[PDB]
Symmetry: C3
Subunit: 150 residues, 3 copies
């Protein structure tokens, strides 16, 4: 229902939606950072958020910075009970420095709906058709897909 | 309920499920790409999608390509209102070239359920037990976990 | 509602919550691994899980390892029908070796709520205000955001 935030400084910007049904609110750097090639920066938003009940806040990469500048977002799990400064962990996999300026949109926050399950240790799980299958078990192409189901 | 898609070319493949309760529909490259070591490619699916109400489309990495070939997916946030070509941002962190061929399953699309909250600026948030705690505050092992809760 | 797990060895640890409303259960390595710079390891938890109905298990990076050690999690999509050993695909983008020890919390499992939609091929999708817009279409700063909506 409501995403609450408070400013921790004059340098913060209220997050904004790129489009009417955008998955995420864009997050603004409060500061300048130089991210050297193959290095990381923790970008302060200088906001604290209170996420609505039944989600967490996922810090996700924008596609523009990813495709154009080889920028990625690490970490990314903002918990419903976190009241600290929301930090964006930026990864520069590019060959050139990446310059963040105060007021640049360098990530997006998604209200990812989750269950908060109680954990239950059991001795044996039920079986499934997938079973232990993983790590490319279903193959690479359309034939492999359809072979797998026979 | 329904994931709608339309083909933007003869080169596209309808996405397929790896298993009965797979989280994602596998996405097929429509083209050949050579991804050099420590470089990226934007892989066209040549599909446009209309995601159901209450989710976005997350482009996620397959575990086979990740574990075997050090392949990763950047960006990944397909918005409910996006009607463009779904692009997969592929990252090759491996030492060898990675070859994508038309018809290779090189990612998966998950209908991630999200809230579309209205954003509300407040002066002060409520407090929590976690508070400002983050960035490894709870430590590395089982003792650290249980110490934290005392 | 319930996250079921079974131990596949004496070396496993039941996953634990970092905080009362943590998004994820922390996952413990069952073994020692040396992750060389710019290399990957598949870390065995030696647990199998049965995820509740209506989610998948996303293996997500912790922020401490990300910010301090340039550690990232690849792959990450644990399907509801998977009954195998949950593996964490760890990426070391740092300059130094990263040492995993048995009993280290090196990732977190989130019960990400998803739709399992039936897929429907159509000839034409409806139009939207975003349309084909993506890959940085809305720009870099607050002016660009507000220009875009005019
Ligand atoms: O990080 C991960 C990712 C996947 N897995 C396992 C469980 C999951 O259900 C299974 C398949 O995951 P993906 O569908 O994401 N990868 P891929 O498509 O390559 O495997 P498959 O061909 O078997 O579906 O691999 C892990 O153990 N750790
Ligand atoms: O990208 C991020 C990730 C996390 N955080 C903050 C908020 C989050 O609630 C808190 C802890 O996140 P994680 O649980 O994902 N990382 P870690 O387990 O290392 O921290 P902790 O030991 O405090 O739980 O760190 C950020 O500010 N930016
Ligand atoms: O992996 C992706 C990510 C995004 N996209 C497309 C669809 C999505 O709706 C659109 C915008 O995604 P983001 O909002 O995550 N990136 P960015 O903010 O840079 O683009 P924009 O300024 O247009 O919102 O780009 C892809 O095709 N593949
Ligand atoms: Mg955007
Ligand atoms: Mg799969
Ligand atoms: Mg944590």
């Amino acid at each position: 229902k409501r995403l609450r935030f408070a400013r921790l400084s004059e340098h913060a910007t209220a997050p904004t939606k790129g489009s009417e049904r955008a998955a995420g609110y864009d997050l603004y750097s409060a500061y300048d950072y130089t991210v050297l090639p193959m290095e990381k920066a923790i970008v302060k938003t200088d906001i604290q958020i209170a996420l609505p009940s039944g989600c967490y806040g996922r810090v996700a990469p924008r596609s523009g910075l990813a495709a154009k500048h080889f920028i990625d977002v690490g970490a990314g799990v903002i918990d419903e009970d976190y009241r600290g400064n929301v930090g964006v962990v930026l990864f520069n996999f590019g060959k050139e420095k990446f310059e963040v300026k105060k007021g640049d949109r360098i990530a997006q926050l998604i209200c990812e709906r989750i269950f908060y399950p109680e954990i239950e240790e059991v001795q044996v799980l039920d079986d499934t058709e997938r079973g232990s299958g993983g790590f490319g078990s279903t193959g690479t192409n359309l034939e492999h897909h359809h072979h797998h189901h026979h």
